[PDB]
Structures are given as structure tokens and as C-alpha cells.
């Protein structure tokens, strides 16, 4: 009755820690990830202090391998200021994450040229990943094709931005892109649901059109992707709100679902949680893991999951089939039927591991 | 000095074993792959018992168990007789074999009602992979998508071809492709020095033209892959001359000096060597398993390589930098500097691991 899956991979998910601890940490964040399938994560650098620099990738490092619960990988943030500065860290690193687009943190880049000298000074042979959204995708695949390397773009969103990369990928260049379960379940049309705090998230909820060109083109779409981005239901509905949703206890029920439904194969499902996340991030296999899950059950998302501290969830009321119902981590019984029972720093860095290094020329 | 790289994995390869064990076995085959750096085969079928139904599989089975020094996993080939016959043994093989061109053996296919009935029975979640060439490529593309599934094209080896999945591909539909060896460094300019006999193979080197879109086109290409055909040099020489090149030895030096001059990079080798094939035909890890290699050492191809028993190679002559120091395979010493120190019978059939079953719905 059950189906087994390999460990699954989310390469996109902000946990927090250090410096944001009660939206959620390493501990309560790859808690929810084990109860979603979720056996290694890529963890982003927005954290406080930021992970831009290498005092602080030490000190978030030592954070989750006392914390994490499952395996993992720390991204470095470009700012402002370290182009040039990274080469001893970088690749102990997931890779390298340029925010180019709105935000106040200290990896606001104020100039393409500051992309450029990223893209120049970064290794060749290491990731890039990028939040560009609508022409900042053409932006940023220009400066790309300047500096003669790959890049991949986070949470493609709109139909905009995955007939861009379609158009670049027939024109055979390397780009690769993830896109996440809030981009292909919900639309405009759960807004008046939300409301305008809870909605709020970047990139914003893209129109039915939107989603339905993510759909047509899933050949496009490399990876999944949750874009973890637990905020408290406080911080959601404030004056303020953050933009960002939780997802990783519910992404891969929302998949499954589909998966039931036709709309994609277990296959399609797989390349884009397993093969094609190992591939673009060079991230190695974890032995002896693996993933149960019932393809039978019926049931309704309520208004929070379990684990993740952001304590409410935008797919509150979707009817989903599919269900996590154990996973093995390195031999061990990580998780069962709502249950985890792996201890906080259970979880390795896999960037250390032999295996885990990005192959370079000497 | 020398460079990591994981255990590499070869699609397609002829080993010879059952019936044609003069021209090589499982045993001399996998010690060619472990020089070349190969630790991971996937035998094709046209043996003689050719491997179409399940005591052929059996027997096949067992002779690479007790032969191979290298992991492996057997494909099934398709015949005039065998569509709905395979499906209690097809998930242990590597896939399912269609030779769509030219060929008298009992994998003849004498119609395209016969390639239907294959992509209709063969079970929807496992590898299907065809010797198609020129027009036999889009005719195969279209069975596939008259049956609504994927389909993995063979050493393409024309502009035509590479063209063609391109336009494929543009359009989201399932194909993916390999190109081998002797299609990206050799050409008509070659047919003299080789000769008709030694320079027979299928499909027929290209022209210069030919071999310039494929590299051109190197974006298209999902692996590399060798076609590793041995048949001694008295055959290639004789009155009728069976097709096919010799390449498990030669391939990873080859695209290793392309890489050293830039006509590639270390990962577009190690996507197509490693992470391509592993996902397109859902082939496990190896644990404590990766090659070492030297970029800087200069060499000759000799006129024959030291394993194979083809003991003839259509490369003699061409100067190559970088070659395999060293292998080691689930924790043992496989291969150093020209000695195999693994026997016959370490190789393991991958499809009994299992993390080396394809996923399947209930
Ligand atoms: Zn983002
Ligand atoms: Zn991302
Ligand atoms: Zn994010
Ligand atoms: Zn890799
Ligand atoms: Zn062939
Ligand atoms: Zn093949
Ligand atoms: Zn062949
Ligand atoms: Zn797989």
C-alpha cells in the first residue's frame, strides 16, 4: 500500500536561525521538514546577523549541527560589500544567493554592476541561485551570459518569467529554475480568502493564467521548491506583514495530490524533489534514507501543521490525497504518523562529507 | 593534483556475454570500464541467447554476477514476439531495448504497429530507450507521444538528429538523448587512416558538419554514453565487417582533454557521466565509490587498449591529457595505474539494491 521514495531535497528554505527564532529554528524547521518528506535542505541566508560573511556562515554552521534534525546546507548571501571576500568559505557553502529585488537586509545590491562583480568573483564551479522576479530574470540572466556561467532561479511565479526561461533555455543556455507549491495551488482567487496580510508573500500569488502557464510548462521547471518562510500568524496579520508562507509540511501532500489527479507523474514529481536538486547544488546521496508515503488518504489541510513555529498555514481548507508516513534518515527512524524521532542534531552539514565537496579542477 | 570524481556510469554498453565471449565478457568488459573510470555499466540485450525473454534475463543475470567487476543492471530487448510478455520481469531490468534500424537478429522490428505495442505494454514508470537514426528518431518521437510517454534516443551522431530533440525539446515533450564518443572526435576525415572495415559502425561517423552541431548543441546532449561494440580486429578487418567501436577505455580520457581545453566544463562532463544517467534511468548511488583522475598527464592512444578484448581502437593516434590514477568501488581499491585489483564477480546488479528500484505507484 505504501510507496517508497528516496530522501527528498528542498533546496529553498529560511529557518531563521540565528536571530529569528521564535517565527521558527533549525530544530522546529527540519522537524517540519522530516514530517513533509523532507530529508536535506538548503537553508537561506537572511538570518540575523546575515550569513554574508564567514564569522558569521561559522557561527550559523555550529547553530545547525546542534539543531538541525535532518540534514543540510547553509547558503552565503552576497552584499554590498563581500564580492571578492568569499573564496576561502565559499565552498563549504550551498552556493551563493543574490537577492535583486526589494528588500532592506544587508544583501540589498544597489547596482548591476555589484551582480557583475559577484558573478565574477564567486567560484565558477559553485552555485548561484538568485530572487528575481519578472525583468530582473532577463537582468539577471544577461549579467549571467556576461560572466560566462550558469545561474538558477528561485520561485518562478508567473507565466512572464517561465516563458523567459523557456526562451533562454531553447536558446541553450544554463539556466535552471524551482518553483514553489504556493505558485501552483493558489492564485488571486485564494485573496479574498487570506486576506491581505496572510497574502502576503514575494513573489506575490500570481493570477489563474499565471498558474496554468506553470502547468503547460513543467518541462521548464527543474526543481520544487518550498521557499519555507515561517513568520507568526502576529507578524502575518500586523501592520507590517512579512511576505512569506510555511510550506514544507505541506508541499509534498499538495504534489502527491496532483500526482493522484494526473496532472504530473510520480517521475515528474521525483526529478524535481531528488534528481535535478542533486545535480544543479553538486549536494550528495544520503544512505540508507528513505521516504513512505500512502497515496490513499484522504484528508483536510487545517489551520496549522504540527511543527513548523509559524503556527498557520495558507492552505488551510485544500482537500489533498497522499500523506507522509515514515522516513529513515541514515538508518535511523527520523519520523512516524505525526510523530519525529530524531533529537535535535541528528542532522549534518553535507557539505563536509567527502561527497558533499563540488568538483573542481585543480 | 589530481581531481575526485564520482563513480562515473556508462548506459550503453555491448559486453558480449552470453555467446560472443571471444569479442569480450562480463569479466574483461567491467575491467575496461574500471580503466576508463567507469564504475557502473548497463548491458544491452543483442546477446547470443539475445536477452528478450525471462530465462535469457536469468542466465544473463547470473554470468554478469559471477563475471562482473563492476556494478551493472542488464536491459531487456524488444522483438516481433515478446510485447506483454515482460512485464513480471521488467523492473529488474535496466530498461527495455528497441532497435528500430537495420539488424537481423531476433530484435527485428518489422513495423511500427510492433514499436506501438511496446511503448502500450512495457510498464509506463520504466526506461525506454531506442537505436533510432535519421527519420527513425522523429518516427520513435511520435509513437511516444501517440502513447503519452518518454522515450531516450541513442548515440545521436547527426546534425539531422541533434536538431531534430532540440525542436523536441522546445516544444516540453519527454525525450532525452546520449551521444558517444566517436561521434564528437572522429569524422569522415578519419574514414581513410580507419579504413571500410575498422571504421564501420552504427550509426556511420558524421562529417565534420555533423560533429561541430553536436558540440555546438551541447546543451541537448542529457549524457555521454560509449557504445562500447567490441568485435576483434580479424572481424573488423574481414569480409563482413560487424559494426561497432571499442570505447569504455578511451571515453573519459577523451572528454577529459576537451574539458582541459575548454570545450567543456568538468560539470557538463559530470551531468552527463553522473548525474544525467542516474536520474533518466533511476540507477542508485555507490556508496564509498569515486574515480580519481590526472588532468595534466599528456599521452597517445596506443593501437590497442589494455583491457578490452577488442584489442583495436578506432582513437590510435590521437593525443589525449588526463587519465584515471585511481577507482575505488563500494570501499575497495578497484583500479590503480594500469591494474584491476577487483576480481570477477565483485560487480553487483544495481536493480537488486533497493535504493535501485524505479518508483512505481501501487
Ligand atoms: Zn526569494
Ligand atoms: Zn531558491
Ligand atoms: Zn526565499
Ligand atoms: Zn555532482
Ligand atoms: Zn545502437
Ligand atoms: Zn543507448
Ligand atoms: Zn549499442
Ligand atoms: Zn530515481
Request: aromatic share 6%; glycine share 8%.
Amino acid at each position: 500500500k505504501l510507496v517508497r521514495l528516496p530522501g527528498l531535497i528542498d533546496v529553498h528554505v529560511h529557518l531563521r536561525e540565528p536571530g529569528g527564532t521564535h517565527k521558527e529554528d533549525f530544530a522546529s524547521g527540519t522537524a517540519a521538514a522530516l514530517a513533509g518528506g523532507i530529508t536535506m535542505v538548503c537553508a537561506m541566508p537572511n538570518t540575523r546577523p546575515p550569513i554574508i560573511d564567514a564569522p558569521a556562515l561559522a557561527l550559523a554552521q555550529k547553530l545547525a549541527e546542534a539543531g538541525a534534525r535532518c540534514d543540510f546546507a547553509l547558503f552565503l548571501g552576497a552584499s554590498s560589500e563581500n564580492a571578492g571576500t568569499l573564496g576561502t568559505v565559499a565552498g563549504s557553502a550551498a552556493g551563493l544567493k543574490l537577492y535583486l529585488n526589494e528588500t532592506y537586509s544587508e544583501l540589498r545590491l544597489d547596482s548591476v554592476v555589484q551582480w557583475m562583480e559577484h558573478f565574477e568573483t564567486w567560484p565558477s564551479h559553485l552555485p548561484i541561485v538568485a530572487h528575481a522576479e519578472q525583468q530582473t530574470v532577463a537582468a539577471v540572466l544577461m549579467v549571467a551570459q556576461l560572466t560566462q556561467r550558469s545561474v538558477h532561479i528561485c520561485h518562478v511565479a508567473r507565466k512572464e518569467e517561465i516563458l523567459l526561461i523557456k526562451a533562454a533555455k531553447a536558446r541553450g543556455l544554463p539556466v535552471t529554475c524551482e518553483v514553489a507549491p504556493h505558485h501552483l495551488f493558489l492564485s488571486h482567487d485564494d485573496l479574498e480568502r487570506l486576506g491581505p496580510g496572510k497574502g502576503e508573500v514575494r513573489p506575490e500569488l500570481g493570477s489563474r493564467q499565471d498558474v496554468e502557464a506553470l502547468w503547460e510548462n513543467m518541462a521548464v521547471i527543474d526543481c520544487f521548491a518550498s521557499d519555507h518562510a515561517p513568520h507568526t500568524l502576529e507578524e502575518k496579520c500586523g501592520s507590517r506583514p512579512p511576505p512569506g508562507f510555511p510550506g514544507l509540511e505541506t508541499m509534498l501532500p499538495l504534489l502527491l495530490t496532483a500526482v493522484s489527479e494526473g496532472r504530473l507523474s510520480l517521475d515528474d514529481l521525483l526529478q524535481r524533489l531528488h534528481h535535478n536538486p542533486r545535480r544543479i547544488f553538486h549536494l550528495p546521496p544520503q544512505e540508507d534514507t528513505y521516504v513512505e508515503v500512502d497515496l490513499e488518504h484522504e484528508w483536510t489541510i487545517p489551520s496549522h501543521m504540527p511543527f513548523s513555529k509559524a503556527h498557520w498555514t495558507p492552505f488551510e481548507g485544500q482537500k489533498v490525497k497522499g500523506t507522509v508516513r515514515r522516513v529513515v534518515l541514515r538508518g535511523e527512524v527520523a519520523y512516524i504518523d505525526g510523530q519525529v524521532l530524531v533529537p535535535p542534531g541528528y542532522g549534518q552539514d553535507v557539505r563536509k562529507w567527502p561527497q558533499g565537496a563540488v568538483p573542481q579542477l585543480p
